[PDB]
């Protein structure tokens, strides 16, 4: 659309503060893939035994 003063403004922000105003160093933690496969075969196992 148009953007010409925001460049200078956020450049000023980066020169002034530096490592913030977008993101910080985060607290690292594992991904939480959650679909799993145990419940898929639990019914089959219970039927089998």
């Amino acid at each position: 659309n148009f953007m010409s003063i925001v460049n200078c403004l956020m450049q000023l922000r980066k020169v002034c503060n530096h490592p913030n105003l977008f993101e910080v160093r985060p607290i690292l933690t594992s991904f939480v893939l959650e679909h799993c496969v145990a419940s898929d075969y639990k019914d089959v196992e219970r039927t089998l035994l």
């Binding site: 145990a38 075969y41 039927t47 089998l48």
Partner: protein
């Protein structure tokens, strides 16, 4: 589905044939190989019949002549619901299981059973749950209200299933399925009721739902399980974990015998059906004499699936021995099997295959470019052209034109070498590469 990038046999969609088991000149991906295609169709019909066990067919021929392509075609035309286990000969040698045990597991994986049961189901929109405390008159006074498309009714809970609905946070106004005997509660999402009430939840609820019919019905549940899964399940306390971790560890024979007896009793009791799928072995020459000897006996078992074999060589030394045998297989195993041969490829067939690959990889080729690719394929090999056609696409994009011309193919040919040219260059300057004895000359001078 099954999100994939590309495969060397991606264009093949289930062989190609008629209702009379006659092969069309070009259909469903593959061209030519009429006799081999008809033989594969006969094998497929035999597999679909399911009344014949333990047949061995060996597909043999020169390399790069529709062997794995034919296997993919028959596997695709066989469709789902019938097991098809494709393995390579080099993945049987393992440090955890003996080759006999791995071969047995591969054989068992290729045969499935469908267990059919009948269960009553309760479905509909739930509108309100009421739960009480523990009282002398009644341990728990709980009631459930269910609304279908035509019926509203009241159920009374019997002191246990309330733990079922309180184990996970469920709530009214949604369609749920509950089994009378099983007792499992499956929340399918959110009911329809009024659109506005569930139109501002931020997607979720799996595109909601609307009640369809009555409260309770009787349905049939069919479970398809391979035999090997049954042995793994019954081997240990929790074998279904081993179905993913792969630490079965040479299941004992008593378990297998018990599984066989129980499955047979089910079959003549009408409680389960047997689907005898297919086991395919690529590069069978990589196997061992012990594996072949075991296969000789494993083929004659009652629960033996149809076995397909693919080999390249002819009259080579079998692994584990010191004598030369045809196809890299012993004489007795060859006698036990039926051989399907494949021929070379014509220039017209090469051109048709290249055009199919072009239209598969969304690449446009000019007529002269296709002619040059066909000439190179006839001169050197099919796979070299099938790779050059894809590698020339980037060169074409570098010139800011989508169409591929003769110059792009020439540039690709002059950039990426070939087996014959590389061999000639190596023989011309053998003093620079590492010799067989390890002698190398590195200094340019002298």
């Amino acid at each position: 589905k099954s999100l994939s990038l590309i495969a060397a046999h991606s264009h093949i969609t289930g062989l190609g044939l008629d209702e009379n088991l006659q092969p069309r000149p070009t259909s469903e991906g593959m061209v030519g190989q009429l006799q081999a295609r008809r033989a594969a169709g006969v094998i497929l019909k035999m597999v679909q019949n399911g009344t014949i066990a333990g047949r061995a067919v060996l597909v043999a021929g020169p390399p790069s002549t529709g062997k794995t392509a034919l296997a993919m075609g028959v596997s695709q035309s066989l469709g789902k619901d019938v097991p098809f286990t494709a393995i390579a000969g080099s993945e049987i040698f393992s440090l955890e299981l003996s080759k006999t045990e791995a071969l047995t597991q591969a054989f068992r994986k290729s045969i499935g059973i469908k267990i059919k049961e009948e269960t009553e189901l309760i479905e509909g929109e739930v509108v309100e749950i009421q739960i009480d405390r523990s009282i002398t008159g009644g341990h728990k006074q709980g009631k459930l209200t269910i609304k279908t498309t035509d019926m509203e009714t009241i159920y009374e809970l019997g002191n246990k299933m309330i733990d079922g609905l309180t184990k996970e946070k469920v709530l009214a106004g949604d369609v749920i399925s509950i089994d009378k005997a099983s007792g499992k509660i499956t929340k399918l999402g959110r009911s329809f009721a009024r659109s506005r009430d569930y139109d501002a939840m931020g997607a979720d609820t799996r595109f909601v739902q609307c009640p369809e019919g009555e409260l309770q019905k009787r349905k049939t549940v069919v479970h398809t399980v391979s035999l090997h899964e049954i042995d793994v399940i019954n081997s240990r306390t929790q074998g279904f974990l081993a179905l993913f971790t792969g630490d079965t560890g040479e299941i004992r024979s008593e378990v297998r015998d018990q599984i066989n007896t129980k499955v047979a009793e089910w079959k003549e009791e009408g409680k389960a059906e047997i689907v005898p799928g297919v086991l395919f072995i690529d590069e069978v020459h990589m196997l061992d004499i012990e594996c072949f000897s075991f296969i000789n006996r494993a083929l004659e078992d009652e629960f033996a699936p149809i076995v397909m074999m693919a080999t390249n060589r002819g009259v080579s030394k079998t692994r584990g021995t010191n004598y030369k045998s045809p196809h890299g297989l012993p004489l007795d195993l060859l006698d036990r099997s039926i051989i399907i041969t494949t021929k070379s490829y014509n220039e017209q067939e090469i051109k048709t295959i290249l055009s199919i690959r072009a239209q598969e990889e969304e690449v446009e080729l000019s007529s002269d470019a296709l002619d040059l690719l066909t000439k190179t394929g006839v001169e050197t090999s099919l796979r070299y052209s099938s790779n050059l056609i894809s590698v020339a696409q980037q060169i074409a994009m570098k010139r800011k034109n989508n169409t591929v011309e003769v110059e792009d193919v020439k540039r690709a040919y002059l950039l990426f070498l070939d087996s014959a040219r590389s061999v000639k260059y190596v023989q011309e300057n053998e003093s620079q590469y590492i010799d067989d004895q390890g002698n190398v000359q590195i200094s340019i001078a002298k």
